[PDB]
Design goal:
The structure is cut from a larger assembly and holds 2 copies of chain A.
Chain A lengths: L43
Amino acid sequence: MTFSSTSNLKELLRKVVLDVELGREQVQLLYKPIYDSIADSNL
Amino acid sequence: TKEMKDFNQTFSVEILNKSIGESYNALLNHIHLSPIINFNYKASNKTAFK
């Protein structure tokens, strides 16, 4: 037979997912060139 | 609060544990000696200045 006869039966076909980027973009830290950093746990 | 532990440098759990121990010892003196001081003594158990 032809494949088009069994194209409806999606459970028989293997599942391959189109790997596309999803979700909001990674957030970069833009302030660091402006701000000088001092770290001290006992502030 | 978490701010008290973090921002108040002098504060720490050692101070609280010290007060638990102190008030606990003061409780031991109370529960064991309060029956003596607080009793309503009868005339048989009272003795005057003399």
